[PDB]
From a paper:
Six additional cocrystal structures of Mpro bound to the product (cleaved N-terminal side of the substrate peptide) were also determined and comparatively analyzed. Our cocrystal structures captured the N-terminal product after the cleavage reaction was complete where no covalent bond exists with the catalytic cysteine. The N-terminal products carboxyl terminus is coordinated by the catalytic dyad. All 6 cleaved substrates bound at the N-terminal side of the active site superimposed very well, defining a “product envelope”. There were no major rearrangements or shifts in the backbone and except minor side chain conformers, the products bound similarly to the noncleaved substrates. Overall, the product envelope recapitulated the consensus volume revealed by the substrate envelope for the N-terminal part of the Mpro active site.
Residue numbers in the entry:
A (entry chain A), B (entry chain B): 1 to 305
C (entry chain F), D (entry chain E): -6 to -1
Write the structure that this text describes.
Amino acid sequence: SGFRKMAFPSGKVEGCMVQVTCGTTTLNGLWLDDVVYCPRHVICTSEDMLNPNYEDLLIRKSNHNFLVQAGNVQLRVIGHSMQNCVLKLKVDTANPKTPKYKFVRIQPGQTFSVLACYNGSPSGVYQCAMRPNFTIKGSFLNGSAGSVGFNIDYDCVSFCYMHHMELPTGVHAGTDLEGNFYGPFVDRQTAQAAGTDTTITVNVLAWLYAAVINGDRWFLNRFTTTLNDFNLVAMKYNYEPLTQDHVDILGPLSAQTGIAVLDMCASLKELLQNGMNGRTILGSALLEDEFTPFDVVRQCSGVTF
Amino acid sequence: SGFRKMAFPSGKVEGCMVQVTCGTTTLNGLWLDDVVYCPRHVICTSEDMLNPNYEDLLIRKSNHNFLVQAGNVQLRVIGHSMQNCVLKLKVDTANPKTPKYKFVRIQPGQTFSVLACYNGSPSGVYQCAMRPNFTIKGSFLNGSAGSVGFNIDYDCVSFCYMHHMELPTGVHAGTDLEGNFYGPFVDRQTAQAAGTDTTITVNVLAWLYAAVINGDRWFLNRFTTTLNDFNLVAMKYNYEPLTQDHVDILGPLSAQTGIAVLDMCASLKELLQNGMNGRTILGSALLEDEFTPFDVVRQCSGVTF
Amino acid sequence: TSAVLQ
Amino acid sequence: TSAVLQ
């Protein structure tokens, strides 16, 4: 028993991380076969980051200007192109530790592990959700751009995020591995703001199921509810309306615990309206929305990789 | 910006995980050089686990009774011995993935990453603290014994925990890698209970410093307190006493923020007596105690490995 | 309840 | 406020 924010083992991703320097700017790159992928703003100087003309900046850059280091091995850049907001640096060597991998675009509400890196080297691992407003609530400093988010299934690493930048509320924005941002953000130090965020209702219900699995029951055996009455309440508190699809998604947990989804909904309804009254669920005094139903099934069953 | 429960990268540890089967009992082992370390209760049947005499039980075993699988390759056991509550199985092949490593015994209030494993395969990684009562609040199912906790320093893995058992309140107990239990617990399915726990004061302060470093300052005030007065409040709220060694350990954080430790202590005293008035600190409605001062420095400085 | 060996 | 490229 017990329930923790649990990240995927990072070993397969650690072997792909490299350092990319251009001028005075250093960040991380992702080394897969003979290509290193990295944020394009590695070509900026500190005077270029307000209104960067990336096309013109890349023109005045040649291959030898990209210093790429894998551990204590220098890679040779033999070609460069810019794709959306990433650079693709062709190197003279294939990464022998390249794992089986996919590039995917994740949906808001889904979660992933982040391997936070500096100087091409792993610093730590933690779990994030893609918020509805397309930011993530990460832990990133200067030099972390190029760190990636991923999921693992068997032996296949699905990369879904590459980090680029921090917004003024201290949240983070980045791209998929094609270099296309999540959300209406651009890689420039212009005035930008995250949009209003909502709470991931289906994840909160999954975590409540996790808590029941682990013997927390004080919030249960509420008078039941219907879907519409639940959504009337949910939207008052900035929760995403619940759909039959979301109800369908929660079946496996509902069946496992023997608590009907709409009964959990009624427990959540009461929690929204009355709070927890100083009490805690799985060590938290706030409703947690960064565990998906799969995250719960995966941790409470013991799926391995 | 941002502050997350961040685990160490796990790749160096992943390559040390193996599976150990003895009869119908399976759990995990740690393969370093030509030795596999694992909890000794792998030799138990289910009827053995009430009041085992492990000396007798081990005498009754031979090398051929231990099936050790490193993925798909079976490692042949050529020697066995017991050290307190761990088994040391000598194998005929040294792990070619053995990292630079140390065995350390950690103190209550220190943290570490857990690589949770089943059948010698990693399922996920997460960060734990050794509670003052010598338990840990982990996420462990049956089959997870022999999972290890660790810290990394430079390129050296410091293994500090091996998981053995779950206590009835759902918390976890284990040994160092020399097989000595943390706390007054024994590896037998008898009636055992964790002592009353307390909150790790120096860690709450470290985390309050993290909050300030990340722009959360609403809880600060103009007051200072003495160490003695603060500890009279600490004792009332079941917090560990703050020592002058703890004040010194907070030195990097007081330096970075300009907030003296006894000035932060006046904030903490006010939070304890008054609560948070519906506000949050670093996304939490509770005072968090599982970050050490070094954990804050590591994350907010970008220390890598 | 008793301890549970995992 | 301005975004920060990291």
